[PDB]
Structures are given as structure tokens and as C-alpha cells.
Design a protein around this ligand. Structure first.
Ligand SMILES: O=C(O)c1cc(=O)[nH]c(=O)n1[C@@H]1O[C@H](COP(=O)(O)O)[C@@H](O)[C@H]1O
Ligand SMILES: O=C(O)c1cc(=O)[nH]c(=O)n1[C@@H]1O[C@H](COP(=O)(O)O)[C@@H](O)[C@H]1O
Lengths: 256, 256
């Protein structure tokens, strides 16, 4: 098993994956903040304060009440300052012809500011082809949703295998997965795992939590995605540091 | 098999489904326009001119370059004038806690103007529970994506059966499906079928077309969803009338 720094140099590595893996090793962080807030001011204050602690800030641009492209300009300034990627968790899931417009256009112009986006594999490989026609020219990357954290998820068995095949057949653009575990044996591919908290539990709408030690250490994922475990805490900086140290040590102990 | 008018009166019918079925029978239309345009002025001119020909106007609010809530106010005025429902084809596909905010909030406030939305069933029933916590109080309906029109679709076999079970277990809010065929034997549930053109063919990004006669007449669906077959035509009114007459006669001939 290679370190994040060594994976950053693999011959078939995507440039976006390389950039991410380099800053993970430099900063000793494999934490992605899920910035699930409705106010631009809170998004930007979290990005600035937690920037040093995170490898990635995950957005849902569509829940931001005061979205403007200028808010995202301010977010990019912080991403460059503190060295983290921006991941818009848009979960594209339409035919190729539709998702290309949803990615490039509308009010959000997601491709103009998001290093990474993700997509469901249920519509077939046209979802990836449509996205890649915008994303490849704009030097972006994509994650495929191979497993989900929610109760009743149908992303199991043959579905997960189909997501891995689709990623591996589109390595020019697909850099990894949203998954609960290592699903690809190819080290060029990032595994990002949501549904993470230090304590056992869930929410009232099907979210299920596992710990950083379980998903990084036992299940072999690379990055933890954490929302409420940080966002709902009083001191979001110390919460981010707890999650960072948990995920980083779990990674180190798997490397041996 | 019951007429649309008789289905509108079924004991377990959802109010949104009833409203739709009534106006389908009154206007002799089972055509949903897929208004896949980037300009508000073109969206509203199509809604006004084609309103009399359609039972439903399907939006992708996220590809509209000049979206404002006022554009949607003007769209509702036309929907009320010409009697059609508004369906935002957002394909919600996240955990319940996330989709409730994506449905109610952000810039688009989808629940404030959309009669219908749709959701993928891949995350489990939490996607429906989250949406229904916004949609039930706002008297809205939801369609579940049981089958998809695109090449390589994984929405087959057990997946389609899971979508039908999920719809049937959430009949307070789920009024039907996006499907290629009749998938539910319960007549209270609408079947809407995209991937429709009069001529054989497809697009370059995995879209596959079948005719109105095939999907309404042979496959037993209720409503055709048509985008480019109308939108790319020079005379979009006559194109809409051709699709309306095709879908309506296919429906009548199945009734006998
Ligand atoms: O794509 C994701 O990040 C995602 C996939 C999934 O399987 N589960 C999942 O929870 N998510 C997202 O990750 C975040 C989880 O947030 P918390 O449950 O608050 O930690 C939310 O923004 C979800 O939309
Ligand atoms: O939800 C849908 O309407 C949808 C599901 C699906 O399986 N296939 C499908 O094409 N659609 C949508 O229906 C429309 C099809 O448009 P045309 O291919 O131009 O007729 C697009 O807006 C798609 O996003």
C-alpha cells in the first residue's frame, strides 16, 4: 500500500487526484468538511477557520440561500489560501445531454468553480460522457457513487461492480468514488466515505454513521466526509481537528 | 382499464394525480412538454403557445440562465390559464436530510412552485421521507424513477420492483413513476415515459427513442415526455399537436 504522497505520482493518476493527494500528505489531513449550511457567511467563515484542517470542502450549492458566483469566488480564494479542493456534491443522475447543461450552465455554473463533482451510475455511462464533455476541457474530476450511507441503499453487489467498471473505463475524468469502503483495487482511484461520526447512531431520515477508524482503518477508504459531526458542534475547529486526527491515524496504522 | 377521468375519482387517488387526470381527459392530452431551454423568455413563450396542447410542462430549473422566482410566477400564471401541471425534473437522489433542504430552500425554492418533482430510489426510502416532510404540507406530489430511457440504465429487474414497492408504501406523497412502461398494476399510479420521438433514433450521449404508439399503446404508459422532438422543430405548436394526437389515440385504442 502506497502513501498518499506516492499515490500522487502514480503513472495513471489524474491531475486533480494528484493535487489532492499531495495536499493530504503535506497537511496530514484526509478530512472532507461537508459544509451543509444555508448562509454564505457561515460557509466562508467555516472554510477560512477549518481550511488548514481539511483536504476538501464539500458543498451543496443548491441549499445556499444567498448563493452568488461571487460567494464561490470568495470560497476559491480560501481554497487556494488554505490548500483544499472544492467538491460540489450535486449527484448528477440524468441523461448525458441534460447533465452537461446542469454542470456548465444555469445560475450555479458548477464547472466554473468545482474541482470535483459526483454522479450516480444508475443512468448508464452517458451520465459520465455528458459531464466529461464539460469537465475534461475545464480540467475537472468526477467521483462515481458506488455505495451510499443511507438505510435501504440499492448501491450493493452488481451495482457497486458496475460503478467501479464505469470509473475504470473513464479514468480520463473519473478520479474516484463515494463509497463506504475500498471498492477499486487500483490505487489511482480516491475513496471518499460519508456517514461518519465518532459516536454510534444515525438521523431520523435514514442516515447511518460509522467511525473514522472503521471506514479508513478496517474498510480501507481514503477520506472521511463529515457534516453534522462538525457543523452541529459548538467549536467546529476542535471538532474538525478531532475528525482529522482520527482519520489520519487510521490511515497511518493501515500503512504500517 | 379505466379512462383518465374515472382514474381521477379512484378512492386512493392523490389530489395532484386527480387534478392532472381530470385536465388530461378535459383537454384530450397526455403530452408532457420537456421545456429544455436556457432562456426564461423561450420557456414562457413555449408554455403560453403549447399550454392548450399539454397536460404538464417539465422543467430543469438548473439549466435556466436567467432563473428568478418571478419567472416561475409567470409560469404558474400560464399553468393556471391553460390548465397544466409543473413538474421539476430534479431527480432528487441524496439522503433524506439533504433532499428536504434541496426541495424547500436554496435559490430555486422548488416546492413553492412545482406541483410534481421526482426522485431516484437508489438511496433507499429516506429520499422519499425527506421530500415528503416538505411536500405533504405544501400539497405536492412525487414521481419515483423506476426505469430510465438511457443506454446502460441499471434501473431494471429488482431495482424497478423496489421503486414500485417504495411508491406503493408512500402513496400519501408518491403519485406515480418515470418509467418506460406500466410498472404498477394499481391504476391510482401515473406512468410518465421520456425517450419519445415519432422517428427511430437516439442522441450521441445514450438517449434512446421509442414512439408514442409503442410506449402508450404497447407498453401501457399514461403520458409521453417529449423534449427535442418538439423543442428542435421549427413549428413547436404543430410538433406538440402531432405528439398530443399520437399519445391520445394510442391511449384511446388501448381502452377499446
Ligand atoms: O455524496 C455524499 O457526500 C453523500 C453520499 C452518501 O452516501 N451519504 C451522504 O451522507 N452524503 C452526503 O454527505 C453529507 C453527510 O452529512 P452528515 O450526515 O451531516 O455527516 C450530506 O451532505 C450528504 O448529502
Ligand atoms: O425524468 C425524466 O424526464 C427523464 C428520465 C429518463 O429516463 N430519460 C429522460 O430523457 N428524462 C428527461 O426527459 C427529457 C428527454 O428529452 P428529449 O430526449 O429531448 O426528448 C430530458 O429533459 C431528460 O432529462
Amino acid at each position: 500500500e502506497l502513501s498518499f504522497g506516492a499515490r500522487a505520482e502514480l503513472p495513471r493518476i489524474h491531475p486533480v487526484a494528484s493535487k489532492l493527494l499531495r495536499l493530504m500528505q503535506k497537511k496530514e489531513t484526509n478530512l472532507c468538511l461537508s459544509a451543509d449550511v444555508s448562509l454564505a457567511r457561515e460557509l466562508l467563515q467555516l472554510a477560512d477557520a477549518l481550511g488548514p484542517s481539511i483536504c476538501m470542502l464539500k458543498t451543496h450549492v443548491d441549499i445556499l440561500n444567498d448563493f452568488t458566483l461571487d460567494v464561490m469566488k470568495e470560497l476559491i480564494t480560501l481554497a487556494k489560501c488554505h490548500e483544499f479542493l472544492i467538491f460540489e456534491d450535486r449527484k448528477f443522475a440524468d441523461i448525458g445531454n441534460t447533465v452537461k447543461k446542469q454542470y456548465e450552465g444555469g445560475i450555479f455554473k458548477i464547472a466554473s468553480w468545482a474541482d470535483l463533482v459526483n454522479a450516480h451510475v444508475v443512468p448508464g455511462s452517458g451520465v459520465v460522457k455528458g459531464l466529461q464533455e464539460v469537465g475534461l476541457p475545464l480540467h475537472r474530476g468526477c467521483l462515481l457513487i458506488a455505495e451510499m450511507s443511507s438505510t435501504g441503499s440499492l448501491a450493493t453487489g452488481d451495482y457497486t461492480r458496475a460503478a467501479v467498471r464505469m470509473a475504470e473505463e473513464h479514468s480520463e475524468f473519473v478520479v474516484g468514488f463515494i463509497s463506504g469502503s475500498r471498492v477499486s483495487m487500483k490505487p489511482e482511484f480516491l475513496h471518499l466515505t460519508p456517514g461518519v461520526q465518532l459516536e454510534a447512531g444515525g438521523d431520523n431520515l435514514g442516515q447511518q454513521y460509522n467511525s473514522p477508524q472503521e471506514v479508513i482503518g478496517k474498510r480501507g477508504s481514503d477520506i472521511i466526509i463529515v457534516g453534522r459531526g462538525i457543523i452541529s458542534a459548538a467549536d467546529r475547529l476542535e471538532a474538525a481537528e478531532m475528525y482529522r486526527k482520527a482519520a489520519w491515524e487510521a490511515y497511518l496504522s493501515r500503512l504500517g
